[PDB]
Each structure stands twice: as structure tokens, then as C-alpha cells.
């Protein structure tokens, strides 16, 4: 475990996630202290919501650390899919909290109860320094995207709380409180839609969207090879971000040059961006 | 609409599944209503847990009907993975809420009895006992998780029975207890789904793969084996790829047929053997 901490600081994203998690946990200890000073009334709720956040950054950091592990017998492809899984979990996290924020609006829609706003401001400043840290979220693509979306959702929630509060005291419009929550849950769901679509596509063994538009041309170029009869059973999927795996079976002439066909097919799919290609070659009867 | 109303009358097992999900949803609505009227966090937690059990059954049916679909250019492998995904999603939605339940517990533990009719806990016990009795006996990772969750629901109903008879506060302890039980119930389904989604070598294929590699190496004119990748597409559907290096004059037709035989006997449905002739 002593060498684990050196590995965490070695990586850029891993160290950024570790620093953000530690800062969140220090803000956590300070918050929980102010709570156990009998002011816990909404404080402890905020404390466990933020602990859930800390769990989200912990999941992202663990995915980043695991993704660099060497492949083994059980995990032939390595642990790179832990990146994609993170982007699946984080998005699936942000929807869930969204609904609760939705539900929270209902809690102040029928009979809203009026139950010193400073902790929201420090949480906000935490959120601005976090989004400054994770500006890259525009294999660590799904991890950074999910973590940036989580930070954006928390920043939005702070904006909503602050806006509702400033209409509470200085302006006194009670109607505008639930609608902020409704709108902002809507906004975070629309924010997490694309990451979830890409993660679901990757995990469903779907053809990579970037590779999908250039695949018929590759099939045509493979068809034009001398001695190739037909193509079948072509399967292309995404292992991790920008890493594509492809498999295909060619029928060829009974006396075709298998070496040259293999080299040309691999070249054709290498210019297309396929990193791992398996071309089975079957000689025909005639 | 009306066709589905008469279709389930013709069959029996689908009618039993419909009764299962309908009673689950109805009693979930009932428990949510009573927990809103009262302040029984254990009752609300059981409502959420079962609510999500019923959604697990419904999403399993939806995943089966989607996995029935055909493959196309975008989805070359079909929509079978949805099955796995459904199970995975269930676990996530079973781990989030339960953890959040943890929250409400410990929160309440720091800083509204309303007994009214607290006897619905034994009704939930009877319903969960009926459910686990009915479910006591490709749909592997769709309903095994549901069976584990209904067992956890029976245990949670026993826990809320204990909480109610103690009420005549022991509610936060039973809340964190059911949260722990839900987590330990969803550990194995999540482990299986994570293993499949991480492109891991199929566990039923692991111990037979060294023998397959040794038998493939024994084939005449094979020099070495490279880049062996095996993974689970869906239940009992394995995909395997490997690159053979062979002699410059090796019988590639025979080696291909023998390698495919070796891996077909081991249960690999789809196999891709790339044969590379060596220079020497």
C-alpha cells in the first residue's frame, strides 16, 4: 500500500481525483463537526449527500488506478473497461440524485417548511475549484467525463440552493423554490444523457460510432483484394476509449496468397483505427 | 392493450409472473402510502426495496424482449448484452437507495410514532413468504438476482416486524440492517455482471483453457500461440480469438479445423483463429 500512494501521485487524473477527494473529506470533517455541535438539523443530511459525492469521486479514482493494471489470465484485455464502467456508474448516479432533487422539490411543493447558509457558499467555492481542476472533461475519458458531470451537478445544486435562498430573504417569493429544483434536475439529466448513451453503447458490444461510418469502405477495400471471395461475421466493438477490437472471417480462393491477404486486411483496418484485428482466412473448395 | 388482457389467460406460467409483479407493485404502493401517512422508515425502506424488485422483474422482461431482437450494422452482436446490463443496473439502483436509507437512519439517529395500523408488517411477511415459495424452484442473470432480492425482502420484512413490535427508537438500527442485507444480497449478481462487462475470461471456461492451449500447441506445424482473448457475450455464449504462428508450409486448413474443434468442445460458440505463417 506504500507503493500504491506513489502510483496515485504519478498519474495526472489519479492525483487530481485524490486531491479533490481529500479536500471533500476535509470539508466533510469540518461540516460534521459543525453538525455534532447540535446544528445538525439539515447539516447531517448535507453531510451524507456529500459523503455520497465522495463515494463517486472514490469510484472514479479507483477506476483510474485499476485501469492501468497489467493484464492477466482472468482479464485477457486488462482492466481498461473499469474506465467505461465508471462512466456508466457515475452517470447512473447522477440520474438517481436528480430524481431525489426532483423529489426534494415535491417536499417543498405541497407544504414547504421554512427549515446560516454559509456551508452552501464554501461548497460552491469547492465546486468552482473542482470544475477548474477537471476542465479536461469536455484510458481516462469516461472517468473524467463522469467526474466533471458530477462536479457540474453539485455546482448546479449549489446555484439552485443559493438562488432559492436569495429569493427567500431579500425578495420573498416563495413560489420560485420548487421550480428551481425541477428545472435543475431536468438540466442534470440532459447533461448526463450523452455519457450514458456512449457507455451503454460500449458495454452493449456495439460498433464504435467513430468506426461505424468508415466500415463499409473498409469492407469494400477488403473485397477488392485479389483472391478474396467474400466477407462475413465482421464484429467491431469498443474495448476502452479510442481502442477498437475487430474480428472477421474471409473466404478466399483455394490457392490465394494468404500472407498478402492478411497483411492487406490488417493495413486496411489499421488505417481505420482498429487496434486489435483478428482475420480468419478460410480457403474455399473451388 | 386488450390483446394482452386475454393472452395471459391462455398461458399459466406467464399468468403467475403477472400475478407476482402485480402483487409486488400493489403492495409497494400500499407500503409507500402507509409510510407516508405514518413515520415508519423501515416500512418505507421495504417499500423502496420491493418497489425496485418489481422494477427488476419488469426490466428483466423488457431485456428479454429486447434481446429477442435482430442484429444490424450498429449492433453486430445483437441486443443480448441488455440482459446483463439490466441486472447490473438493478444492483446499482439497489445499492444507491439502500445506502441512502443508511443516511436517513443515522441522520434520524442523531436528531412521530403514529402507530395507527402497524400490523401490515405481518402482511408483508406473508406476501414475501408466498413470493419466495413461488420462486423457490437465457434467463440466468435476470431472475437469480430477483430471487436473492426477494429473500432479502423476506428478511427485511422480518426486521420491520421486529421494529414494529418494539415500537408497541429501534427504527434506525433495522434500517441500517436492511441496507447491509441488501448490499450483501446484491454482491454476487453485481460480481457476475461486472465480470461479464469487464471482458473477463468466462469462469466456466477458465480451468479448461490451459488444456485447450496445450492441445492446440500439439497440432502439427504450430509454432506458438499468441493473443488469446476469451469473453462472455451473454449467458453461455462465449467469444474467443487467438493468433497461431505456424510453419511456413503448414496445413492451414487442417490446423484451422482442429483449433475450431478443440475450442468448440470447450464451449466457445464464436471463435476467430488467425493463422500467420512464420518465415522460418
Amino acid at each position: 500500500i506504500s507503493g500504491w500512494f506513489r502510483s496515485i501521485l504519478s498519474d495526472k487524473t489519479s492525483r487530481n481525483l485524490f486531491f479533490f477527494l481529500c479536500l471533500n473529506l476535509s470539508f466533510a470533517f469540518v461540516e460534521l463537526l459543525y453538525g455534532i455541535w447540535s446544528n445538525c438539523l439539515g447539516l447531517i443530511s448535507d453531510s451524507f449527500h456529500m459523503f455520497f459525492d465522495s463515494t463517486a469521486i472514490l469510484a472514479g479514482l479507483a477506476a483510474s488506478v485499476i485501469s492501468k493494471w497489467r493484464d492477466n489470465d482472468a482479464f485477457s484485455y486488462g482492466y481498461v473497461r473499469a474506465e467505461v464502467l465508471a462512466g456508466f456508474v457515475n452517470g447512473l448516479f447522477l440520474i438517481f440524485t436528480a430524481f431525489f432533487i426532483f423529489s426534494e422539490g415535491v417536499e417543498r411543493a405541497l407544504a414547504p417548511p421554512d427549515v446560516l447558509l454559509l456551508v452552501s457558499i464554501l461548497g460552491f467555492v469547492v465546486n468552482l475549484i473542482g470544475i477548474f481542476v477537471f476542465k479536461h472533461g469536455g484510458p481516462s475519458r469516461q472517468i473524467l467525463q463522469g467526474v466533471f458531470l458530477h462536479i457540474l451537478a453539485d455546482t448546479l445544486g449549489s446555484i439552485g440552493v443559493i438562488a432559492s435562498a436569495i429569493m427567500m430573504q431579500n425578495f420573498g417569493l416563495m413560489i420560485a423554490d420548487p421550480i428551481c429544483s425541477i428545472l435543475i434536475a431536468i438540466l442534470i439529466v440532459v447533461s448526463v444523457i450523452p455519457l450514458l448513451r456512449e457507455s451503454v453503447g460500449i458495454l452493449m458490444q456495439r460498433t464504435p460510432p467513430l468506426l461505424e461510418n468508415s466500415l463499409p469502405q473498409c469492407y469494400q477495400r477488403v473485397q477488392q483484394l485479389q483472391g478474396v471471395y467474400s466477407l462475413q461475421e465482421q464484429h467491431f466493438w469498443t474495448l476502452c476509449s479510442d481502442v477498437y477490437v475487430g474480428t472477421l472471417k474471409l473466404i478466399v480462393a483455394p490457392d490465394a496468397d494468404a500472407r498478402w491477404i492478411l497483411s492487406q486486411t490488417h493495413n486496411i483496418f489499421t488505417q481505420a483505427g482498429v487496434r486489435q484485428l483478428y482475420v480468419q482466412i478460410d480457403f474455399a473448395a473451388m | 392493450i386488450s390483446g394482452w388482457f386475454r393472452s395471459i389467460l391462455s398461458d399459466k406460467t406467464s399468468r403467475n409472473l403477472f400475478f407476482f409483479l402485480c402483487l409486488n407493485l400493489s403492495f409497494a404502493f400500499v407500503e409507500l402510502l402507509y409510510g407516508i401517512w405514518s413515520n415508519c422508515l423501515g416500512l418505507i425502506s421495504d417499500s423502496f426495496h420491493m418497489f425496485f424488485d418489481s422494477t427488476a422483474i419488469l426490466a428483466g422482461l423488457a431485456a428479454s424482449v429486447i434481446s429477442k431482437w435482430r442484429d444490424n450494422d450498429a449492433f453486430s452482436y445483437g441486443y443480448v448484452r441488455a440482459e446483463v446490463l439490466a441486472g447490473f443496473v438493478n444492483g446499482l439502483f439497489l445499492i444507491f437507495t439502500a445506502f441512502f436509507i443508511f443516511s436517513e437512519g443515522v441522520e434520524r439517529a442523531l436528531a412521530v410514532h403514529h402507530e395507527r395500523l402497524l400490523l401490515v408488517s405481518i402482511l408483508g411477511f406473508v406476501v414475501n413468504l408466498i413470493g419466495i415459495f413461488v420462486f423457490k424452484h437465457p434467463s440466468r442473470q435476470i431472475l437469480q438476482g430477483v430471487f436473492l432480492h426477494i429473500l432479502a425482502d423476506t428478511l427485511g420484512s422480518i426486521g420491520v416486524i421486529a421494529s414494529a413490535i418494539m415500537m408497541q427508537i429501534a427504527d434506525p438500527i433495522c434500517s441500517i440492517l436492511i441496507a447491509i442485507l441488501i448490499v450483501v444480497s446484491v454482491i454476487p449478481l453485481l460480481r457476475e455482471s461486472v465480470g461479464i462487462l469487464m471482458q473477463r475470461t468466462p469462469p466456466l471456461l477458465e480451468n479448461s483453457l490451459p488444456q485447450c492451449y496445450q492441445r492446440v500447441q500439439q497440432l502439427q506445424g504450430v509454432y506458438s500461440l499468441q493473443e488469446q482473448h476469451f469473453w462472455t457475450l451473454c449467458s453461455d455464449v462465449y467469444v474467443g480469438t487467438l493468433k497461431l504462428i505456424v510453419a511456413p508450409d503448414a496445413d492451414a486448413r487442417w490446423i484451422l479445423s482442429q483449433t475450431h474443434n478443440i475450442f468448440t468442445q470447450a464451449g466457445v460458440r464464436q471463435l476467430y483463429v488467425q493463422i500467420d505463417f512464420a518465415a522460418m
Partner: antibody
Amino acid sequence: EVQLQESGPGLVAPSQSLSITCTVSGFSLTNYAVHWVRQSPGKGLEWLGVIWSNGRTDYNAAFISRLSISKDNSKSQVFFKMNSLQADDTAIYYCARKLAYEGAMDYWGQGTSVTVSS
Amino acid sequence: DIVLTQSPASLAVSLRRRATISCRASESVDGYGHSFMHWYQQKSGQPPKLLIYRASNLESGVPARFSGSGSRTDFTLTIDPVEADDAATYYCQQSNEDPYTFGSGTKLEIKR
């Protein structure tokens, strides 16, 4: 011009060793496998083994304990050594070039008769 | 191993007729549309000469009067028309399994 010529002792004492050198011409040992096959009036044609271009050797399982095939590409020679020669080992031994990308033997040597007697 | 039985043991055919030699395999020597069965001819005091490979393919340079057919476990070598040079022993060899095994042999006798 593809040619294989075997040279070995016609007479071998029982329980001794037999050594045949097959010289090849017209093709390289660096891209062709060479099979060893014996023919006797009793057991007919029997496949003994094959040596591959990288030096991999495959043997008939009935001879795994007493057979060894080696080669050298520089002089284009294949060496066939059998041990514990018995009374039924008297046969005509051929080194045959494998047919490329097939399981057959496209070219054969003239063979050497080996008689195991005292 | 795979046992190959050749029937008949001896065959007598006249000039310009058809000769049929049959090889039976104990187990299938087929794989994915390829029958790994080969036919050799051995004349008087000569090494065996390959005639057919993969049960239907003529070796380059052998005459067109030779033909092969069959699949799974039944294989046929056909000589049509039969010449005087075709007096020899004909062998079937499978290469679908280790070890390679040869047939017992069928001696073709020329009738005149």
C-alpha cells in the same frame, strides 16, 4: 530437380542403433518439413515422424521413446536415429518432403533397406 | 489411430476400362468441408508417388485419368481409362489425426 537421397547401414545388429542421413536438393530445409516413413511387407506403410523448419519434431506415439530426428540447414541434411532395433524393424525407410500446405508427401527418396539380423 | 481399410485387396481391370479403389476410414477425416485424405501410387521397386491430396485434388503433373471423390469416411480413387502403366499398388493416407496412417494397399492388375 527436387531430390532426397538417404544413406544408412543396410545391416544393423539387433538392439543396436540405426542412423540414416537424408540429403536434400532442389529445396531448402528452412521452409519445408521432412517426414520419415517406413514400409515393410508385414505392417505396410508406417509413418515415423516429421521435422519442421524451426526444428520442431513430431513422432509417431509408438516410437516416442526410441526415435530422434534432427537436421542441419547448412548442408541440407536430416538425421534419423532409432534405438532398440528389433526383428520387425527391417523395412525400407524413406525421407519424404511434405506437400506444402497439405498433409501429403509430394516427393520421396528412393529409400534405404534396413535389415536387422545377427 | 484412424484405421484405413482398402477394398478390394486386389483388382483386375482390362485396357481402357475403369478401375475403382475404395478406402474406408474408422473415424471421419473431414474438417469443415475438407477431407484430409490422399492417394499414392507405388510401382515395382519405386517410392510411393502422390496422386491425390485432400481426396479430390490432382497433384500437379499426374495424368488426368486419375480422379478422387468422397467425404467423411468413404473415399474412391478412379482410373479411367486404365493404362498399362497403371499396374501398381495404390494406398490411401489420412492426415486428419496424429499419427498419419496409410491404407493396406490395393494392387491393380492389368488384364489383356
